[PDB]
Amino acid sequence: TSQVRQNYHQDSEAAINRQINLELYASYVYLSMSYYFDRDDVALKNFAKYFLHQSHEEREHAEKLMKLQNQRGGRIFLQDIKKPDCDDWESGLNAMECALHLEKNVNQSLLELHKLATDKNDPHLCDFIETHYLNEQVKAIKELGDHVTNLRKMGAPESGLAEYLFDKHTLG
Amino acid sequence: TSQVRQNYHQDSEAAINRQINLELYASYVYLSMSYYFDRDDVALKNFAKYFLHQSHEEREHAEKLMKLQNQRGGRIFLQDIKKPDCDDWESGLNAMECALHLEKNVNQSLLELHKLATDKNDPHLCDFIETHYLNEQVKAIKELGDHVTNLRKMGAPESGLAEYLFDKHTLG
Amino acid sequence: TSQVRQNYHQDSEAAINRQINLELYASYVYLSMSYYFDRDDVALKNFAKYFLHQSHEEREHAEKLMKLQNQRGGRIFLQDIKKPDCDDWESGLNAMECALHLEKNVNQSLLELHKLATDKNDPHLCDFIETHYLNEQVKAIKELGDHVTNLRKMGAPESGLAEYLFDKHTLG
Amino acid sequence: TSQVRQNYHQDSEAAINRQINLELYASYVYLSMSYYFDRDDVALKNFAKYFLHQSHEEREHAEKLMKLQNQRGGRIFLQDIKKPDCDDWESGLNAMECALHLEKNVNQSLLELHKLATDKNDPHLCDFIETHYLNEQVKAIKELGDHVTNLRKMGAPESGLAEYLFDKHTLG
Amino acid sequence: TSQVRQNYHQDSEAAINRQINLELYASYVYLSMSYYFDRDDVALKNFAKYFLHQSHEEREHAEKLMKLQNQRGGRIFLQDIKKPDCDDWESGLNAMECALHLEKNVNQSLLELHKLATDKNDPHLCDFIETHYLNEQVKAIKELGDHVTNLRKMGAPESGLAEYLFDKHTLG
Amino acid sequence: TSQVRQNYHQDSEAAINRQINLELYASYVYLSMSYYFDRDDVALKNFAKYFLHQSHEEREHAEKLMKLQNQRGGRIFLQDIKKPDCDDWESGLNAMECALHLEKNVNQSLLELHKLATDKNDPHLCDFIETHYLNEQVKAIKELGDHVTNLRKMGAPESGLAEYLFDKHTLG
Ligand code: NA
Ligand code: NA
Ligand code: NA
Ligand code: NA
Ligand code: NA
Ligand code: NA
Ligand code: NA
Ligand code: NA
Ligand code: NA
Ligand code: NA
Ligand code: NA
Ligand code: NA
Ligand code: NA
Ligand code: NA
Ligand code: NA
Ligand code: NA
Ligand code: NA
Ligand code: NA
Ligand code: NA
Ligand code: NA
Ligand code: NA
Ligand code: NA
Ligand code: NA
Ligand code: NA
Ligand code: NA
Ligand code: NA
Ligand code: NA
Ligand code: NA
Ligand SMILES: [Zn+2]
Ligand SMILES: [Zn+2]
Ligand SMILES: [Zn+2]
Ligand SMILES: [Zn+2]
Ligand SMILES: [Zn+2]
Ligand SMILES: [Zn+2]
Ligand SMILES: [Zn+2]
Ligand SMILES: [Zn+2]
Ligand SMILES: [Zn+2]
Ligand SMILES: [Zn+2]
Ligand SMILES: [Zn+2]
Ligand SMILES: [Zn+2]
Ligand SMILES: [Zn+2]
Ligand SMILES: [Zn+2]
Ligand SMILES: [Zn+2]
Ligand SMILES: [Zn+2]
Ligand SMILES: [Zn+2]
Ligand SMILES: [Zn+2]
Ligand SMILES: [Zn+2]
Ligand SMILES: [Zn+2]
Ligand SMILES: [Zn+2]
Ligand SMILES: [Zn+2]
Ligand SMILES: [Zn+2]
Ligand SMILES: [Zn+2]
Ligand SMILES: [Zn+2]
Ligand SMILES: [Zn+2]
Ligand SMILES: [Zn+2]
Ligand SMILES: [Zn+2]
Ligand SMILES: [Zn+2]
Ligand SMILES: [Zn+2]
Ligand SMILES: [Zn+2]
Ligand SMILES: [Zn+2]
Ligand SMILES: [Zn+2]
Ligand SMILES: [Zn+2]
Ligand SMILES: [Zn+2]
Ligand SMILES: [Zn+2]
Ligand SMILES: [Zn+2]
Ligand SMILES: [Zn+2]
Ligand SMILES: [Zn+2]
Ligand SMILES: [Zn+2]
Ligand SMILES: [Zn+2]
Ligand SMILES: [Zn+2]
Ligand SMILES: [Zn+2]
Ligand SMILES: [Zn+2]
Ligand SMILES: [Zn+2]
Ligand SMILES: [Zn+2]
Ligand SMILES: [Zn+2]
Ligand SMILES: [Zn+2]
Ligand SMILES: [Zn+2]
Ligand SMILES: [Zn+2]
Ligand SMILES: [Zn+2]
Ligand SMILES: [Zn+2]
Ligand SMILES: [Zn+2]
Ligand SMILES: [Zn+2]
Ligand SMILES: [Zn+2]
Ligand SMILES: [Zn+2]
Ligand SMILES: [Zn+2]
Ligand SMILES: [Zn+2]
Ligand SMILES: [Zn+2]
Ligand SMILES: [Zn+2]
Ligand SMILES: [Zn+2]
Ligand SMILES: [Zn+2]
Ligand SMILES: [Zn+2]
Ligand SMILES: [Zn+2]
Ligand SMILES: [Zn+2]
Ligand SMILES: [Zn+2]
Ligand SMILES: [Zn+2]
Ligand SMILES: [Zn+2]
């Protein structure tokens, strides 16, 4: 047992390790999306920049969870980072919809983590999740929903002009 | 024989003279394209600026090859600069596709030059080509491919609105 | 076939995808090492900082390879990022020795990639590897060898005072 | 007929195209001279700089004529740029004398162009020629005549010391 | 075997040691030349400055090769630095011609080193030579050839006025 | 006889040439030491920096003696620079002891030179030696003796921790 460990349940430690893997997976998905939009036959540089930024953000989220795991005296156990579901993301609108799905999945995992911390009476972990992850997820989901709505209203994915102008004016 | 000449094959000297002519020809092609887009019945000022910039860049490439020829003790032999294949470049998309074709032709010539320098065991010439021309060509080809992709997706050449907005937002 | 693809062999494209996976794996290994040294029962903050910096550097190397893959018209195919070989890295000296082993493995992969590009007469790829990866690997290997030498001479891993003072004076 | 064309005779349009070719030819001649003086067995860097500057100036003159052609609604028709008469320019004095001959040829062409514009009652073209080309040619011819006079008086081409000191003190 | 050594052939290590000695020898030759021109009966201060600068440059080249030898895990073996061939360098023109000969000798040694590294499939060593030595040698040879050409054309060595004015205007 | 030579004995001229060779030899010894400490299996960067600085200082001493030789109208005669006695300097303490021995040898040579200049009634040479070399040698010897004393008291060469901390705190 770690000399710093206090009120940190083994179930919470395991769930934090699972969340670390999920954040690294999300980082990998976003990296794949970014370099899909960097292809010469897609060529939407601001979509690529947006998703690269999201990938780095998700890496930071994972690293903050690893720091938490050490702060509480738990032990980090890493697992394989599975490859993303797609190599070809088909369009800016499709990539935004997949990103929305992924962010809602990550949010659900975080809500289950908060429920577990509440059940184990771990207020520090509950506060950590609320302070650093929950409103970040709500804001990310709202932003992606806005992007999806605007692309659809502009005529994406059928309008390449729609995705070009969205790349310029919203993501630029 | 030049007092500075060392490990510089006559075949390499001839191929450098051929490359000088090819770069000057590319400069002339781009100059023609630029002033096509400066016509009152075409009137795409940022296409004109883009191609004028490319023309000056190709002139600089030719001058760097002439400097190399003198540095190695070879002798520059200039030839006629042939007129470009077109007077009317028909559209921004067509001009970008022709520019892509031209840059791939110049790249192929440079790869043949590198093969010759490798065969003649001229590492200074190989390094010169790699350092100053090969990645420049790869970047130029990727940029032109991106431009072609975006124009096609926006609906060029049938959409004059597409070429207008591309002129404003990508080339502006 | 990509509109930008020129002198880019399918074998080279596959080897670049393998190298991308290897760089991401190295990033993951370094991330694991960093947060091992962030544990309360290890508590070497400058070892943790060093390895976190290396992890971000390896991510950048992977992203540069993905950019190259797109520049040449190849297609990125991502694979699972396997978990690192260890969860517990045992000591600063042991982690440095493992890092040296990993960097020499990455260097060997890059040398095989250069041999393949030479065999396929791809001077742009050869130059890319030489310019951005080979001297970086040589410098990294020399630095890690220096660190290992100094830790051993100071008495690591048996001297915790040795690793403490190395953390302060070399990595701080 | 161009929507902007007014009081622009077809003969004037043809003569402007001929002048464009002549200016590009002069640019090429000066480029050849510059890199003759960049040879290791000639090695007069300020002669090389002088003639490179003249080459870029002549390119600018050609581009201004192309802009005029478009401003008036004429159509640019480019022709081959013939190679310069010499590969070896023999001396600084000989190159200056050839440059003087070339500038007087260009001036004669411009005077014939002005005569044509006067005959066609095209005051805008007459003013354009007078404002941008005629005094430039007179100044260039006077400068080259001064250079030739000084080189001859100093003892060029027989005095290599003469050309060395002229390179340093007049062109430097 | 060094813990950092990888893909570094013993033949390459020996050739690098030979090149180190050759660079130190060149530094010594240039030092001798510099202080020849510092004599009261020669008294060409800018020739002296030029050759002193070259001597320090060659020392830097040798030190960079020693750094490379250590970076790759080879072992430096130093040898005697032989005295220069002359104590009296006879004139500025003669010293420049000897310097040109020496730089071409060093260039030939570097080309043989590059051939050896290519034969041993050592791309890091090939790139090191190309990046840091080959174009430096080509530029140095071209500069010395230019200096020799100008001195000869000015009338050196028979004209002491020629060497005086060259010292002032080219080397000053 | 030089037009500037006055009260400069041939014995003094010969002894100055011998001292020039000795200073160049000392520079070479220090260069060898520096790059011994740059090895990956020694890895004491501040020892390497210290000895590289000493090597450049000894080169400067040699050049000042060459300047003196020319100032007095003597003629510089260079000899081979013999290789240093060791390739492997075994430890920081051993290298410092060898440096102390070398500096005392150079000091003895300078004292013999001063005795010769006194015997030949050459006060300018005596003053030159006193002003530029004698106190420099005394200070260098005292500094090296201090370094040796501290390394021994810290437990070098048996304590690698001793040499590591000396490298950091005294030489850093
Ligand atoms: Na997952
Ligand atoms: Na395409
Ligand atoms: Na979902
Ligand atoms: Na959804
Ligand atoms: Na849900
Ligand atoms: Na051509
Ligand atoms: Na083509
Ligand atoms: Na094409
Ligand atoms: Na091709
Ligand atoms: Na791997
Ligand atoms: Na503990
Ligand atoms: Na290994
Ligand atoms: Na190893
Ligand atoms: Na290996
Ligand atoms: Na003409
Ligand atoms: Na010559
Ligand atoms: Na004429
Ligand atoms: Na004339
Ligand atoms: Na006339
Ligand atoms: Na030699
Ligand atoms: Na005299
Ligand atoms: Na030679
Ligand atoms: Na020669
Ligand atoms: Na040779
Ligand atoms: Na000695
Ligand atoms: Na001694
Ligand atoms: Na002693
Ligand atoms: Na003594
Ligand atoms: Zn513990
Ligand atoms: Zn791109
Ligand atoms: Zn996240
Ligand atoms: Zn954070
Ligand atoms: Zn902990
Ligand atoms: Zn635990
Ligand atoms: Zn694990
Ligand atoms: Zn997925
Ligand atoms: Zn697609
Ligand atoms: Zn709690
Ligand atoms: Zn909290
Ligand atoms: Zn909102
Ligand atoms: Zn010649
Ligand atoms: Zn080009
Ligand atoms: Zn350039
Ligand atoms: Zn030349
Ligand atoms: Zn030739
Ligand atoms: Zn010709
Ligand atoms: Zn064409
Ligand atoms: Zn048209
Ligand atoms: Zn070569
Ligand atoms: Zn080069
Ligand atoms: Zn718009
Ligand atoms: Zn494609
Ligand atoms: Zn890497
Ligand atoms: Zn990068
Ligand atoms: Zn692509
Ligand atoms: Zn493919
Ligand atoms: Zn896949
Ligand atoms: Zn591992
Ligand atoms: Zn442990
Ligand atoms: Zn290639
Ligand atoms: Zn490249
Ligand atoms: Zn029209
Ligand atoms: Zn003109
Ligand atoms: Zn202008
Ligand atoms: Zn027009
Ligand atoms: Zn017309
Ligand atoms: Zn035509
Ligand atoms: Zn001509
Ligand atoms: Zn000539
Ligand atoms: Zn008019
Ligand atoms: Zn008038
Ligand atoms: Zn006007
Ligand atoms: Zn003068
Ligand atoms: Zn070793
Ligand atoms: Zn050198
Ligand atoms: Zn250097
Ligand atoms: Zn080493
Ligand atoms: Zn060895
Ligand atoms: Zn030896
Ligand atoms: Zn010599
Ligand atoms: Zn003499
Ligand atoms: Zn290698
Ligand atoms: Zn190569
Ligand atoms: Zn390298
Ligand atoms: Zn004398
Ligand atoms: Zn180092
Ligand atoms: Zn000294
Ligand atoms: Zn000094
Ligand atoms: Zn003297
Ligand atoms: Zn004498
Ligand atoms: Zn001698
Ligand atoms: Zn010794
Ligand atoms: Zn040793
Ligand atoms: Zn005296
Ligand atoms: Zn004195
Ligand atoms: Zn003291």
Residue numbers in the entry:
A (entry chain E), B (entry chain A), C (entry chain T), D (entry chain S), E (entry chain F), F (entry chain D): 5 to 176
What does the original paper state about this entry?
Here, we show that coating the cryo-EM grid surface with ssDNA, or other negatively charged polyelectrolytes, reduced sample aggregation and improved the distribution of macromolecules in holey carbon grids for cryo-EM. The samples used for testing, hexamerin, human 80S ribosome and apoferritin, exhibited undesirable properties such as protein aggregation and/or affinity for the carbon support on standard cryo-EM grids. The use of polyelectrolyte-coated grids was essential for the determination of macromolecular structures from these samples. Hexamerin, human 80S ribosome and apoferritin are soluble macromolecular complexes with a predominantly negative surface charge.
Apoferritin is one of the most popular samples for benchmarking cryo-EM methods because of its stability and 24-fold cubic symmetry. Reconstructions of apoferritin routinely achieve resolutions of better than 2 Å and the highest resolution approached 1.2 Å. Our test sample of apoferritin exhibited extensive aggregation on standard holey carbon grids, which prevented the use of the images for single-particle reconstruction. The aggregation of apoferritin seen in our experiments was probably caused by damage to the sample during purification. In contrast, ssDNA-coated grids enabled the recording of data that could be used to reconstruct its structure to a resolution of 1.77 Å. The DNA strands increase the background around the macromolecules of interest. Nevertheless, the presence of DNA on the grids did not prevent the reconstructions from achieving high resolution; for apo­ferritin, this was 1.77 Å. For the human 80S ribosome, which has a diameter of 25 nm, the distances were 29 ± 4 and 39 ± 9 nm, respectively. It was not possible to calculate the distances between the particles of apoferritin on standard grids because the automated boxing procedure failed due to extreme sample aggregation. It should be noted that well prepared samples of apoferritin and 80S human ribosome do not aggregate on standard cryo-EM grids, indicating that the macromolecular complexes used in our experiments were damaged during purification or improper sample storage.
